[PDB]
Write a protein that binds this DNA or RNA. Structure first.
Lengths: 54, 53, 55
DNA sequence: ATATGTTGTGTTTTA
DNA sequence: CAGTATTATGTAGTCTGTT
DNA sequence: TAACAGACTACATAATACTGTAAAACACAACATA
């Protein structure tokens, strides 16, 4: 199933501002990369911001 | 699901300065280890300070 | 079955206004394109909104 | 006899 | 965050063709 | 017919694109002392 940008952001470790999450998408930080259905982004529910630590 | 560094520090017996708690993370003295999320660390609620060796 | 516009629209991930969906049909964005039966459009069950540009 | 707190500089990420 | 700009969708009104 | 689907035309709104600014959170270093 697919989420809105809002719905996806609400379900993360820590939700950020929508404006930030959009910048993430513009910057190809999210995989799979969402697709703009009309005027709004759809994330697949499996979609994640990619990262680095341990 | 997690706590921020502040949120975690606030529930410890002795809260310390932010630097000190960061030092601990740097030196792997928190288990389980926190995950970095953007610009801040997120702790497991139950993470403890641990000194090995 | 073939679906009405309304029924088609209702099965999509993000249902829109009927007017929007009609604008799509006029622009050929639905594949396969709907047929015309009397007054109304009727859609293939697997019909999907597609993007006919290649940016 | 060392962990902690304070002050300062700089980078990255967020709002 | 605030601010300006871009574009698809949303809404509303009128009109056209069909049953 | 009266009712309805839809075509069209105009405008309003929402989600985003982009730019610019401030600051949060942290890494690192130096130093002070309880």
């Amino acid at each position: 199933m697919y989420l809105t940008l809002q719905e996806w952001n609400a379900r993360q470790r820590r939700p950020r501002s929508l404006e930030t999450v959009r910048r993430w998408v513009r910057e190809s930080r999210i995989f799979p990369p969402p697709v703009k259905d009309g005027r709004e982004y759809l994330f697949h529910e499996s979609a994640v911001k990619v990262d680095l630590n341990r």
